[PDB]
Symmetry: D2
Subunit: 324 residues, 4 copies
């Protein structure tokens, strides 16, 4: 009989506005969760409960350490979380949890378990069952009958039950009458003792490229609050040839700022007149903004020089990008 740890961090799934104790009170009135087929599980309600829209990077740290404390005593882990920033959390955990040897599944609901038509019970029951019977040792996100690689996800449909997507990678598992493991290529996986990397606050900016954007945007970030800049450029990584704009980017990099180029498109791979690259900009391949932002928080929090970080951002560390 497997034993699963459930971290109830907050989110829509437990709301009525969140209220302490009602999530558990609800599960108690649902016998399906105590079936002989179901693994044993324990729920830890966080204090305070948070709407995921209020999440800060330090909150990823709290969750990572919570998993670390409970690691040896459980066979799997399920993180109940609000949907708004669930993809950011899943992504962060993938980098912070090195040599993960047990499944960590993040899930939640579009409708609170307290409201009618809720998807909370079904996503939670499935995450528990999957973590116990179809364990994949990576940080994953389960939603609407599919298990996705955490650092490949993004909330793509705000109003649908199929809220999340994995644009550049097929899901890892699908649920129907039976649970099927897909032939999705395993991510680089380290074996050995679990290593949990702590992170510290890091000022990062996210610039979206659009017709009429001026160099002032970049110049502003160069003010004082910035160690990295993420650019959401067009298609496979293009931006206007505006010389003034390019010069600001070059100056940003000369000051040790890590500038990464991503595509603003839902799916696609950046493939960079090689101006941007000449301006010191690093290509982020097919990484999501969610994975790039968290990857930066992770790398910037270590004792790595600017050039090492720039090189690591283009490498596949946890399966967040497709090489060459």
């Amino acid at each position: 009989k497997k034993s699963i740890y459930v971290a109830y961090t907050g989110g829509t799934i437990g709301m009525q506005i969140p209220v302490s104790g009602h999530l558990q009170r609800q599960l108690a009135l649902m016998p399906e969760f105590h079936r002989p087929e179901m693994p044993d599980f324990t729920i830890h309600e966080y204090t305070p409960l948070m709407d995921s829209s209020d999440m800060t990077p330090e909150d990823w740290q709290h969750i990572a350490e919570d998993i670390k404390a409970h690691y040896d005593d459980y066979d799997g882990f399920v993180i109940l979380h609000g949907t708004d920033t669930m993809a950011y959390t899943a992504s962060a955990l993938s980098f912070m949890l090195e040599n993960l040897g047990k499944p960590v599944i993040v899930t939640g609901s579009q409708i609170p378990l307290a409201e009618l038509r809720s998807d909370g019970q079904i996503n939670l029951l499935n995450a528990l069952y999957v973590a116990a019977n179809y364990p994949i040792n990576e940080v994953t996100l389960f939603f609407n009958n599919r298990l996705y690689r955490g650092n490949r996800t993004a909330k793509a449909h705000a109003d649908g039950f199929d809220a999340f997507a994995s644009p550049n990678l097929p899901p890892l598992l699908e649920a129907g009458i039976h649970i099927r493991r897909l032939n999705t290529p395993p991510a680089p996986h380290g074996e050995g003792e679990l290593i949990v990397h702590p992170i510290t606050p890091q000022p990062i900016g996210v610039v979206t490229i659009y017709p009429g954007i001026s160099a002032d945007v970049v110049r502003n970030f160069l003010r004082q609050p910035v160690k990295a800049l993420i650019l959401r450029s067009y298609g496979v990584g293009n931006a206007p040839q505006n010389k003034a704009f390019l010069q600001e980017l070059q100056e940003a990099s000369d000051r040790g700022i890590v500038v990464v180029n991503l595509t603003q498109c839902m799916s696609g791979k950046v493939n960079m007149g090689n101006a941007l690259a000449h301006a010191g900009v690093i290509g982020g391949a097919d990484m999501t903004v969610e994975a790039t932002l968290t990857k930066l928080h992770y790398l910037l929090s270590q004792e790595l020089d600017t050039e090492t970080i720039r090189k690591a951002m283009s490498q596949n560390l946890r399966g967040e990008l497709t090489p060459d």
Copy 2:
């Protein structure tokens, strides 16, 4: 015989392995299919200079709108050949600038140059011409990979695929197969009467993405001077962290007369916002894309309207860009 005007503004479609004047036309001359008796007559106007759409500025939308105006009375339909990177921005801008449109305007292009192997250029162009002449829809539309989309509902969603564009919150208007079929997609508000083409003038607009760890400094920066409007790409149905400092900065922006509009950073979905942001003067952008919102702002800010009037208009369905 219908007669179609083709504005060749530039883009991948006519490039070589870099853009070159006359190549596109020289290639089509060697393709008999285009002159078959079943095809409408068409004329190609090559722009000078040809542009990579990534270099497009709002004034370029104006040049195209005025070009359509000049040729309006002499053709039955219009096809705009354009680069894919910002095609959705141009399609969206034209929808607002061309009021009382009584002939079809179809924007299209290709992911691969007509000069390169496996090009989708000839097929997208052939289809746009045939559709404009035989299945006219009096709206600015975008044709790509056998589907015609409402222009101000499109976004480039797949950087590397032939199905590069999507219309996340609205079904296509028409689909091509053995037969061309018009879908039961509800028509957009459509004015009848003489064509009206509204010119636009440069407008400084900022686009801020909400993410864990974002600080009030960013908003404060745009307050510096380079901004008449600010677009927020918020979580899910329009949520953001409730950091008092961040919130106060947004409030000051609105007090200064800056139009702040809230959109979802998700591919699909509708914004629905106590209600902090709303109390901070932020306006809900419903299910509008960033492409439609940015161009709608350029359109409205260019007319002589009070900040009050602009704020109300942004949430109104002017050309079918949002669902009331």
Copy 3:
């Protein structure tokens, strides 16, 4: 789809015919009803009241016959004036045939009739039974579409346009030639799908009686003899599952066999064996009638409906190509 009033508490009638949803480890009388009594979500104030009529015996939908469609239609008629809507709990295997049959049998339908069920028993782990039934009841009470519909996996489909397309998925059903009528997410949204023909007045049930119908699949190597076989004795109609837009071998032997069949008064209907598409019509000269974009489910039940009426062959042939209940797209 109309957005009905939620002012008063609705009363929905549930015809529990059997199916996976109420099984366990095999059907057990009373099991489903007890499970629902134990699930709080079904008894909230925002939910309509409902009454369950358990059929005896409960049936695996794979054992259903046209007689069973008749029984269900009569059950609906018997309770029509006493309830605000009807949900038919059914096995998935032939759910689409039942939904299609009811669309033709029920005339002047002024209340919703929604067929639903589940891929996994309401008991068993990971069941989709609770949600499909919960949604069906809620929709029946709040989005009163006056047609026979099928609800599954957050979508409401026009009954006579559906087919079970994915045997192992929770998204078991599809409506290949028509968009869904309604989709459920954080909010319940209606699609502007065009309306089906509607009558007026009290509900009328068009009964059916046994009709021998053959379903021949066209494949490489099939010959005229193969067809002559169906002309054995159990056939008043023949459904042809042809290639693409309605093509079949054009050799004279095969075509003469079809012409002889029609000369004997047999109604021969041409459909596409493809998941989606419309038949476009050779075969026509042989008396074959085009079935446009109808599903085999809709065509089979439409024939049972028409052949059971006192109509001459010519009238039935004409009616088969006409849109009677929204099962096909006219030119």
Copy 4:
């Protein structure tokens, strides 16, 4: 899917069997291609077209035609680097499936393709499907019989024409595509099919009396009884969901009767996707067809019945993955 070398100029053989692609409103197709510059670019492989006489609408095809095509491939196997079979769309999936079983030790690509609209008509997809097929055959030489359509390469014996009016006419319901084309040609991580070694061997496929029974409400035992009349060495049952049928006593008896007579009865799902999982039917001699398409099952039976195998061996082989047509447990 292997990313082959582009070092030398490949030579691809094109078997023009007929179909919509070359139709008008003989020689027409070949002249059309000569007039299309794209097909003669230096980045393209050289190709030779063999026009069949007469050309055929794929709806008139029989098993003898699959044999004709197989013999044509064997005849030119050593002289070309790849093979593209131009074919009508209506039965393209049956031909691709048949060839997969017939061609043992296939060490070169064989790609079946065509178009929904004639090359002579405007809006045709013929040019792109053929150009892509030739390019894939020369640069991504997967050693299987595949089907190319609408920017995707599918395993032949896993395909079915699913959309009669769309350009995305074909689907592979139970298996992902092998390749997808966009700005770049991407290969999917699809498990390989069983492969032999040595010179190509063509197994004969001859006409075989096989009945295709669709299970539906009201179907009588007479149907099964009628098939047991003569045109039956095998019977394919298109059953409900994961393989269910009426528990009719007379029905089950006629079935057990068929298997007693040496008839191979295979159970498939009538659904677009899914896997059969039968129990009455099993105890009646019915063999489970897993997740095979009707197209793969029909041709697999033609293949096995045409070989030197007894009934017991054929029944066992039907549930085994011979060429990648089904997923093992």
